[PDB]
UniProtKB/Swiss-Prot annotation:
Annotated source species: Homo sapiens (Human)
Highest taxon of source: Eukaryota
GO CC terms of this entry: cytosol; nucleus
Compartment(s) where it occurs, according to its Swiss-Prot or TrEMBL record: Cytoplasm
Entry function: Intracellular transport of retinol.
One annotated GO biological process: vitamin A metabolic process
Tissue/organ expression: Higher expression in adult small intestine and to a much lesser extent in fetal kidney.
Binding site for all-trans-retinol: L40, K108
PROSITE patterns: FABP
Domain notes: Forms a beta-barrel structure that accommodates hydrophobic ligands in its interior.
Protein name: Retinol-binding protein 2
InterPro entries for this protein: Calycin (IPR012674), Fatty_acid-bd (IPR000463), ILBP (IPR031259), Lipocln_cytosolic_FA-bd_dom (IPR000566)
Chief site of localization: cytoplasm
């Protein structure tokens, strides 16, 4: 299924600090952020997506259309400019962010009741699982 609509509560988080280290997020921010449970709110209509990642410590929102390249400032994440593109590979939603960092982006897919996410930067992969609320 390509339907990722929902409010998604984090169940599992693996190597989040490795991914943040690869982005060069400062020590104090990484040490606080790694402790925290996350929420992911996805609003999906056709190719139009609105995605919000939240914790008690951050709020990161992005809007995009599948298959339409967009230039992006990554704002309070790591304050970098990238050229982003989100596409479907089967039922995996794939984001590539072209810029200074290699292998940067993410992948999301549905397994039954749960949303699975990979966040990638450099040689680091963070793996997350969310449950549908
Ligand atoms: C599809 C998933 C996306 C776009 C994101 C998942 C996590 C973030 C994020 C983690 C930390 C952030 N800040 C701002 C410290 S943002 S985005």
């Amino acid at each position: 299924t390509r339907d990722q609509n929902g409010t998604w509560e984090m169940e599992s988080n693996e190597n989040f600090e490795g991914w943040m280290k690869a982005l060069d997020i400062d020590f104090a921010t990484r040490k606080i952020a790694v402790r925290l449970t996350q929420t992911l709110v996805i609003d999906q209509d056709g190719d139009n997506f609105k995605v919000k990642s939240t914790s008690t410590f951050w709020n990161y929102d992005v809007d995009f259309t599948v298959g339409v390249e967009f230039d992006e400032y990554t704002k309070s994440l790591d304050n970098r400019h990238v050229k982003a593109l989100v596409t479907w590979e089967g039922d995996v939603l794939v984001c590539v962010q072209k810029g200074e960092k290699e292998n940067r982006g993410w992948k999301k897919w549905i397994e039954g009741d749960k949303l699975y996410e990979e966040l990638t930067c450099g040689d680091q992969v963070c793996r997350q699982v969310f449950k549908k609320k």
